[PDB]
Amino acid sequence: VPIQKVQDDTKTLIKTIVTRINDISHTQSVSSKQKVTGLDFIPGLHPILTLSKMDQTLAVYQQILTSMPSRNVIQISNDLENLRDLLHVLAFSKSCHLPWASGLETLDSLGGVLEASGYSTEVVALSRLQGSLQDMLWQLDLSPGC
Amino acid sequence: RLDGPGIWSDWSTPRVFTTQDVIYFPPKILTSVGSNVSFHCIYKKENKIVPSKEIVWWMNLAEKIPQSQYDVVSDHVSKVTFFNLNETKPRGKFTYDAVYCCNEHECHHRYAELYVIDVNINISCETDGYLTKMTCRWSTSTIQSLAESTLQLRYHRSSLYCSDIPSIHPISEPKDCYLQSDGFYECIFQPIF
């Protein structure tokens, strides 16, 4: 397994997902950093220093995206799955043992927000996903560690 | 029983209703292009009503509503007035604008829904060569974006002529209109006055 090729593919996949979110017009106008109450459970911009943190973050995002009926979101979820697999193979090439992250145990609350306000949940989840991917891409050259 | 020495009935099953944490009244508004719409909100912070000065309004969590539209009706409730409203563009599946009222920079998930749809439908009526019936045709191009919507042609027949300013009459009659191959609904009045 070529490490460099996997890293470059990971970069391309990240940009691809970012562009996908860019296509979604309503998400672009919404501030990524801005805090909205109730969405706090979504892993937004809070320093993601390590590979295990990245894995659990992506796992939670996949779990949240799976519940929302949208054609674009399913593809994004698949890309996130591929991204996780790429991170796992990289963690193997670095001699790290990444345990397979379960999603959030605490989804019993997410149903309420999805029912009351779908629009807020979708725009926030997408914008925070884009932000999280951007810092991950920034840090991927800094020699991330486990 | 209201009249006479009636007997009180047994108590019904108790009904429990649980409310949310932010009040928008009215929660939803259906309006047209160019109208003025006022939205009122009450924001609660840990079972405490935030003063109207701290309340800041946003449109779809994108940009802050200017303070010129902000009005303080009372110390507990804030309001916003929208003048000369334009048609709300569809952002994906959502055809409405979500207006949020917030405590300063920090915002809440719930919002108010503003539906400005295009009701400008042109109906063209035309009589036959023998002047026995009148077929009126109208298009559905601007109403295809909304599902679960029912369209009904309503007509009111005056005793003589048309008024200079047409207006909606409280007493109106429905008309059976059928969709054709060209996408136009046709309604045939036979006999015609």
Curated annotation (Swiss-Prot), chain A:
SUPFAM superfamilies registered for this protein in UniProt: 4-helical cytokines (SSF47266)
Chief localisation class: secreted
Tissue: Adipose tissue is the main source of leptin. It is also produced by other peripheral tissues such as the skeletal muscle. Expressed by intercalated and striated tracts of submandibular and parotid salivary gland intralobular ducts. Detected by fundic epithelium of the gastric mucosa. Secreted into blood and gastric juice.
Record GO biological process: activation of protein kinase C activity; adipose tissue development; adult feeding behavior; angiogenesis; aorta development; bile acid metabolic process; bone growth; bone mineralization involved in bone maturation
Keywords assigned: Diabetes mellitus, Disease variant, Disulfide bond, Obesity, Secreted, Signal
Record-annotated disulphide pairs: 96-146
Family according to the record: Belongs to the leptin family.
UniProt disease link: Leptin deficiency: A rare disease characterized by low levels of serum leptin, severe hyperphagia and intractable obesity from an early age.
Descriptive protein name: Leptin
Organism classification: Eukaryota, Metazoa, Chordata, Craniata, Vertebrata
Swiss-Prot record, chain B:
UniProt-reported outcome of changing residue 111 to H: In LEPRD; uncertain significance
Disulfide bonds: 41-101, 102-107, 125-136, 177-187
Tissue: Isoform A is expressed in fetal liver and in hematopoietic tissues and choroid plexus. In adults highest expression in heart, liver, small intestine, prostate and ovary. Low level in lung and kidney. Isoform B is highly expressed in hypothalamus, but also in skeletal muscle. Detected in fundic and antral epithelial cells of the gastric mucosa. Isoform B and isoform A are expressed by NK cells (at protein level).
Post-translational modification: On ligand binding, phosphorylated on two conserved C-terminal tyrosine residues (isoform B only) by JAK2.
Annotated glycosylation sites: 36, 86
Domain Ig-like: from-to ranges: 20-118
Subcellular location: Cell membrane; Basolateral cell membrane
Recorded superkingdom: Eukaryota
Leptin-binding: annotated segments: 156-173
Noted disease: Leptin receptor deficiency: A rare disease characterized by normal levels of serum leptin, hyperphagia and severe obesity from an early age. Additional features include alterations in immune function, and delayed puberty due to hypogonadotropic hypogonadism.
UniProt similarity note: Belongs to the type I cytokine receptor family. Type 2 subfamily.
Domain notes: The cytoplasmic domain may be essential for intracellular signal transduction by activation of JAK tyrosine kinase and STATs. The WSXWS motif appears to be necessary for proper protein folding and thereby efficient intracellular transport and cell-surface receptor binding.
Subunit structure: Present as a mixture of monomers and dimers. The phosphorylated receptor binds a number of SH2 domain-containing proteins such as JAK2, STAT3, PTPN11, and SOCS3. Interaction with SOCS3 inhibits JAK/STAT signaling and MAPK cascade.
Protein function: Receptor for hormone LEP/leptin. On ligand binding, mediates LEP central and peripheral effects through the activation of different signaling pathways such as JAK2/STAT3 and MAPK cascade/FOS. In the hypothalamus, LEP acts as an appetite-regulating factor that induces a decrease in food intake and an increase in energy consumption by inducing anorexinogenic factors and suppressing orexigenic neuropeptides, also regulates bone mass and secretion of hypothalamo-pituitary-adrenal hormones.
Protein's recorded name: Leptin receptor
Species of provenance: Homo sapiens (Human)
Gene that this polypeptide is encoded by: LEPR
Section covered of the full-length record: 312 to 504 of 1165
